[PDB]
Paper text:
A widely applicable approach is the use of photocaged substrates, where the photocage is soaked into the crystal in advance and then activated using a laser pulse to provide uniform initiation of the reaction throughout the crystal. In this work, we describe a thorough characterization of the application of the NO photocage N,N′-bis-(carb­oxy­methyl)-N,N′-di­nitroso-1,4-phenyl­enedi­amine (henceforth referred to as NO cage) to room-temperature microcrystals of two proteins: a gas binding cytochrome c′ (McCP-β) and a dye-decolourizing peroxidase B (DtpB). Laser parameters for photoactivation are systematically explored, and time-resolved structures over timescales ranging from 100 µs to 1.4 s using synchrotron and XFEL beamlines are described. We have demonstrated a sample and time efficient approach using fixed targets to carry out time-resolved SSX and SFX experiments with an NO photocage over the microsecond to second time regimes.
Comparison of these different structures revealed no significant changes in the binding geometry of NO or nearby residues in the heme pocket, meaning that only a two-state transition between unbound and bound states is observed. This suggests that any intermediate steps in the NO binding process must be complete on timescales of less than 100 µs. On binding to the heme, NO was observed to bind in an end-on fashion via the nitro­gen atom with an Fe—N distance of approximately 2.0–2.5 Å and an Fe—N—O angle of approximately 105–150°. The variability in these values occurs across the six independent heme groups within the crystallographic model and could represent either genuine differences in binding due to subtle differences in the crystalline environments or simply uncertainty in modelling a small ligand into the electron density features. A small shift in the side-chain position of Asn245 was observed compared with the ‘empty’ site structure in all six of the hemes, and at all laser powers and timepoints. For DtpB, the structure of the NO ferric heme complex of this or any other B-type DyP have not been previously determined, and thus we have demonstrated here that such a complex rapidly forms on exposure to NO after photocage release.
Numbering used by the authors:
A (entry chain D), B (entry chain B), C (entry chain C), D (entry chain E), F (entry chain A): 7 to 312
E (entry chain F): 8 to 313
The structure:
Amino acid sequence: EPEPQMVLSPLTSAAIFLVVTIDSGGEDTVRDLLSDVASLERAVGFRAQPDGRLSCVTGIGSEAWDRLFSGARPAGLHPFRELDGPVHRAVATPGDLLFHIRASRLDLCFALATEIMGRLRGAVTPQDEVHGFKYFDERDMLGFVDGTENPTGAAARRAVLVGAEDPAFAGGSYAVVQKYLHDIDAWEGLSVEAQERVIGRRKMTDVELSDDVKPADSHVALTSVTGPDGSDLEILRDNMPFGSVGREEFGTYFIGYARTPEVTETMLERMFLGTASAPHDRILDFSTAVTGSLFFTPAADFLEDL
Amino acid sequence: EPEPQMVLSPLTSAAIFLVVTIDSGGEDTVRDLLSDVASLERAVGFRAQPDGRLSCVTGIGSEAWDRLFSGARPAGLHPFRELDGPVHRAVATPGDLLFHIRASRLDLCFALATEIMGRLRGAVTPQDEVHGFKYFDERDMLGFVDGTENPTGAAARRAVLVGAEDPAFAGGSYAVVQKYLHDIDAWEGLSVEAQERVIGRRKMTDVELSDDVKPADSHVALTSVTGPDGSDLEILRDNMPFGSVGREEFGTYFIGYARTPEVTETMLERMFLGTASAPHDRILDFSTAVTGSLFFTPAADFLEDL
Amino acid sequence: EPEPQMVLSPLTSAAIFLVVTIDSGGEDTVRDLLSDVASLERAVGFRAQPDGRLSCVTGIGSEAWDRLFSGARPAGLHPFRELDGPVHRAVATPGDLLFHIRASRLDLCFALATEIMGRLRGAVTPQDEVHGFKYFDERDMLGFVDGTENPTGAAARRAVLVGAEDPAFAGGSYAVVQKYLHDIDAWEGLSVEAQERVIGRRKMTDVELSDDVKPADSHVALTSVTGPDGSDLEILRDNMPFGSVGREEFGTYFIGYARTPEVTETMLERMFLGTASAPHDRILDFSTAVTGSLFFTPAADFLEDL
Amino acid sequence: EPEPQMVLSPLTSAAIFLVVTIDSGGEDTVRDLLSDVASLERAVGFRAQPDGRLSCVTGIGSEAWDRLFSGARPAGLHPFRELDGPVHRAVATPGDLLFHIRASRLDLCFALATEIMGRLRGAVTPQDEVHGFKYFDERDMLGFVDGTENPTGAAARRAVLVGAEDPAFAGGSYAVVQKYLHDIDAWEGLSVEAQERVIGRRKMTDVELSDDVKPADSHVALTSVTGPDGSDLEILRDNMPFGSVGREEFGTYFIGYARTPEVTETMLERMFLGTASAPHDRILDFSTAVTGSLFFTPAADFLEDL
Amino acid sequence: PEPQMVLSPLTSAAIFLVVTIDSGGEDTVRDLLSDVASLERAVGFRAQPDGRLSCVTGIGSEAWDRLFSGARPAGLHPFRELDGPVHRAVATPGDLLFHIRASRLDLCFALATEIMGRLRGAVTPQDEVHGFKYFDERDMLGFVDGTENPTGAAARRAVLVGAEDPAFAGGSYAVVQKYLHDIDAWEGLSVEAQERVIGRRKMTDVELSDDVKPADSHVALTSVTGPDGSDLEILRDNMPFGSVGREEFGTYFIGYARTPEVTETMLERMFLGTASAPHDRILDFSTAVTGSLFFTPAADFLEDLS
Amino acid sequence: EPEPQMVLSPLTSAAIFLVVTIDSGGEDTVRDLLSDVASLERAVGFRAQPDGRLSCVTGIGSEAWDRLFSGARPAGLHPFRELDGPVHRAVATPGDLLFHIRASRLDLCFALATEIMGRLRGAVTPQDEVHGFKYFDERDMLGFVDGTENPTGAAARRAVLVGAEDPAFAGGSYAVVQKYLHDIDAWEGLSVEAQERVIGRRKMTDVELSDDVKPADSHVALTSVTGPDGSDLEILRDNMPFGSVGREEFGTYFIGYARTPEVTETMLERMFLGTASAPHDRILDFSTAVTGSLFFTPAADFLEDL
Ligand code: HEM
Ligand code: HEM
Ligand code: HEM
Ligand code: HEM
């Protein structure tokens, strides 16, 4: 009845992230593609069963939603909110549609992106394209294991999927994306122990620092948030490394899924604006966000029903 | 909760299909084998975990049911209905038991089949034995990706498993088998574009032709059927290639699972007898059915407790 | 609702079994460690996604429970009961905590064990440590496939997890461990046929001997038990081989999970004390138990909510 | 500098053996296929780099040689010699061309066999086609590890490749094929220890029996032959299991390569005709030859030069 | 003389880096060249045995004169621009080539990062391409690409400098060209028409017969026979690359040869044509946007530098 | 040409090191086993083709050589020379035979060791048995990638095989073994930067430290040796981690192969006794040798010919 898209699925060794804007007069072409995206994913993906693990998660931005559909909107859908901190800024950049494409091989991702874009040619303008790759033992460009504390099982379901709070849109999710570029030269000037105090975990072994030693402005400290009832508010991250050596571009493509954007936005506010105990997240002293967009990823049957 | 046999499990790289008839006075031997087939599957399969993926699905034909069992019969169980179209015919051939054996390796299939047939020696007569193999990127002998639109998840369960409409047999399914031989000489004389018009999908990329270009007598058009309620009727297919180059035998072994045989039967009727828009399915111009049988595959517990 | 530990997960190619006692005054250090074991499991295991398959099952013994926790006790928790047969004895040995660590590679097991033992230094005393390895096609040191008749799916859940009969501890299980050393010299003086009569299955093919020829004092005969309800009583076994060639140590590390210890204890009594028709299990003529301990493995959330 | 065909390559998981005779008028078609066979092998094989390991060895029989080529003949090429022993017979059957096709997957073998036979349609009559498969840990249908004592490295080159003794044909080899069908019922009536005596090695562990225990009519004893120079005479065997359970067809497809047919013929004589100390090879009491043919497999460059 | 890894096969990932040496950057580059093999080992050893990381370093003609004082490789000269009537092969700056391959992109990226870290401020990047395997060794035109590469001793003879230039024995010459394809134009051809452009069957990769193969097909024009009569061969490690948003669908051409004359002869035939052919038809769908020639010295040459 | 044992082959994921002494009177049994060790290796190893990678290198100590054999001895065969430094000592411990067993899986190593020791029972006394395992990305227990600068190709052959300097023993090698235990508590007290100064390489990335920063008492500095004629003296190391968590045993099993013990001894003297610039190798401040033995590993044909 409420079949979600593959928002709960694990990290893979390859990804493509595509973000586009819909041109004036391109809505009908988009709606037609949306109704077919599941068929296209199967068309390509079936060629590589059992090990291909191809998926595509399609998201739709707030303004786009109003152009495409009449009737109810998801309760939490709004444009990404720019955060202008005293030192660091989280920019909002244009994006109407997100395609988060994952597989165990880049070819599958590329083949599917080709089919999607082929259908949208002349109706959309590309805003961003990133080809992500796994880096060693699930490391990011800063050299730390990245994704460790993601929720799993029932916990992930509860953290990520819209439920009875917005019944018309149950099985959907909200995705926030941000493309970060790192200052690798600066970061490499820190000792490993200083890097560990920025993140909040040991570098090689990935063991969390004890509470008596973890700084209040470490990344793990600032992105740990408790809800009304003492429980952790969780998001599901599918961050991937990307880059270009000749351009000195060493990045993290951030994508986080959550059942309400309020959770992800709380984490961002703490990072960028800081708290009474932390000026800002120290990870931002080595990381610049160059995109920022929010999407709603509907249940799969919503897109079919078109 | 009734425990199904492995009728929902995916395609594998190797398969053995075995169809036998039960000789007069063979019933007791067969019943004792039926009660042991799961333990035989584990005895062989356990040797190859975790990657062996050995399974065996056992089906029983309509006439055999009546020789083996007193009491309730599955509601949809009848002999395969011969279809004598104007040009093409779907023959009915004898078969009392089906063993649908799958694994990631042929040795495991062969070892299990050996143990089964050793127990049935003198009680059964073999009618058909086919050793199927994966062909490139999930292709069939016509060079097309085959299996793409199979249901998955909840949809597959709904489509395949008997439920409350026949509660004594909940968790069962119906399998139809047909062995097809292809005229490869004739097929390979067609252009790719002509072959695509026969199937209804692009050959290399496996993308479905749009509705405005897809012929009414293409295979995909004829095997797409909407139910009374406008709901699509679905089957689960585990087709495998087979052949012998020296005898010019290039085959598709068709096996389709469904909650009721009426669904599969409607598809065959459309293919063999045609519609208002189509004389018959053009695939049949290059494919000849040489067997045809219908089996019920009971819930696993049913076999266990007999 | 309650999340079990990974007690239902399959065999892997590597394991570490670590049994320790809690030293006088070690209680608080152990409680802090128990609250963090899942975190540690993730810290190490995430590095090896997706194929590492690291898990850790943590068990607590009867005496230790009382030292660590106030309030309710699991209903079936008691010290391992020594069985002093006429010929063979099942010894009870000290053990307060069990860590059953599994992965597809030993390095992941060793890394996690290192992190747990580093946190427990000064608070526990090691009692046994075994590094298990897969031996050919899931064989044990006697040369027989080992694990074949383990329950799977729903039958496993039913057989292993505590439910509404003890609702405060639902999602838990009971583990019994015994380290066995084999007399391989004596074993290898037996013909294959004689070995088959000891075990109750064919050696190469792992097919069960038929009821006609299966000895009453065979291993499989004695460990096949039914309730007064008539159903099979099942346990889940994760036995691993281990050894040292220079010391002539050829071993089977037995670990069996069950929803109540009574099931496993019944099997042990049949083995060591025999039945009307069998003096004891013949496997014990070639196998000596040198440890014996019983643990409760709580639901995951019990440990966390510490 | 002559380039051999892939006669020194290892065993693979899948094989196809194809034997055909050349029809009246078929010689030109055959010579054109021979000139292209390496190019066909690449055409198919490159699709599955790095792991497909596709190869084709092409052999030519004695009578066919003379129909296809003028000028010199290989020194040792003659028709297979039938051996009519007092109990068992090594039969000779027709065969002009051999294709020995190997890969890690059957699809590659089948695709190459399809391209080959497509070229040859109307010029050849198929005599035999077998699809071989790996059986557990390099076992044959008798349950023994099969291939152990094959030569490797320098020793294999010396044993298999024609050298200065026949310089115009240096880089070639001689292949003897025999299809054997086994009496599995008779074989399984022997204890394992009796089977071990027949073969001359331990069944499970593959360790050779000591000289003190090994019978003179054991298979290993009879196929161990020393030359006049005290030199061990060696062949390279690529035999594969095959079968059909319904037909009770459990087979060994024997293929042995050697630098001269006299080595292989000596072994056959010892097996079928026996020695002073053994009437015949006991393996033949459970194994019946139903084909026998001898081929020369030229250097790769010889075929290309056509 | 130890060659660099120019004979090694295709891998699933590659990075191609081309840089120019800034005025005054010569000493830094010499230093790096002396260390490139130690960097390769430093990264590569981490992923033994399946990483397959390699780096081949090439030096252009102008750079050679700037870096070294002694003799020049006899064939070393700037890439020769070809201005054909319709199509042009452009010559673009490039002093150093790093051709980095592995089974995973992370290893490629890590090594590139270390190389470029050492060169920062001494070199200017000219081109960086991240190549990926596309299905069954296909290129962006949908054809299997690499089939007729030489192997074994033929590859060695075709690719490595020998006695004809003894001071440079073990070296090779690499030509690179980055090509972008007009996929829209290409996809408007029938498959049959595309086959006539290439000269091989699309799906099966079988060469067209010499009757059917057009004179202006790519295979016909790149098939070159020397005075001798024997085929002139090169070794190609072409990789796909692209960007879907930018409509960039590319083939990164790299071809290795013992003398540049061979590759240059093929280029002349393609762009300038022959008696029979105005130009290679593949160029109607393919534009070269880079063109550079490099000498890749023996490994000992680079190790022995100041 | 003498055929070496597998002394040049790469590191594997699993290893067993077995060191025994020969009891008085066990010489004949030992000689018989030495003549069979290659047959035993094949017997087990063939079961796991193609990926088992099982090998066994057999070494003989100086005192043992003189008990087993008569006639000429290898020129550099002597007992391990104890090194009594001011601070650190390298002990000499008994060992007459070494079996260095490697495979991709421990079961294969264990099965072969079982067969070898089965044959030697009652003739030998075990002295050491270590079961080594790969640790992450080729790391040792100190957390550094270990094996990076091993020689490969021709350089490896030159460094490790006896040649014309001792022609009767050409194709042999010398192995030195030392079992090291590490003081992990002390090591973990160092910053990563301080550990890098002890080793001489970067910890995560395995890049060698610059010659300006690399300390003179770093491990890499002291084990880098040039000969009188300017050549680098190299050894081939197949070190493996081992340990036991409950005993707080974290080790490195050192094994180095070289064509003369003089190279390995020179390295050891520099480490333990120091140089004009370094008191001793800083690695020894965290590593204690607990065994030390020297073996000659003869050419394979020497063993076979006994
Ligand atoms: C510059 C970009 C980023 C990098 C390189 C990065 C890296 C990391 C690393 C290494 C960890 C620790 C291991 C783990 O549990 O994944 C972590 C944890 C986490 N990150 Fe980030 N991160 C980035 C941006 C973000 C952003 C933008 C958010 C939220 C809006 C976020 C939310 C989190 C959360 C919730 C955790 C888990 C904290 C916990 O409960 O322990 N991260 N990240
Ligand atoms: C010496 C230690 C042991 C060895 C080497 C061993 C070996 C085996 C083998 C080879 C089988 C047959 C294949 C399979 O179903 O797993 C088996 C079955 C079994 N074993 Fe054991 N076992 C040992 C100890 C135990 C112990 C201590 C128990 C219980 C307390 C146990 C309970 C079982 C059960 C329940 C079965 C399945 C019987 C059936 O239902 O068919 N085993 N074991
Ligand atoms: C757009 C750029 C190119 C593409 C997509 C391309 C594609 C192909 C394909 C599909 C084949 C047939 C299969 C094979 O043998 O690899 C082929 C063959 C070949 N190509 Fe190209 N190629 C390109 C550029 C070049 C260039 C620039 C050269 C030489 C300077 C070249 C030399 C060859 C050679 C020598 C063969 C083998 C011909 C034979 O002996 O059958 N290619 N290429
Ligand atoms: C105590 C335990 C030992 C440890 C943990 C260890 C560890 C290491 C490490 C991490 C490296 C750097 C990476 C590489 O392998 O190239 C290295 C290099 C080396 N080690 Fe050791 N080692 C040990 C003992 C020894 C011994 C006893 C010797 C010689 C007798 C030795 C000889 C070498 C050599 C020759 C190199 C390469 C130096 C170079 O040319 O860069 N090691 N070792």
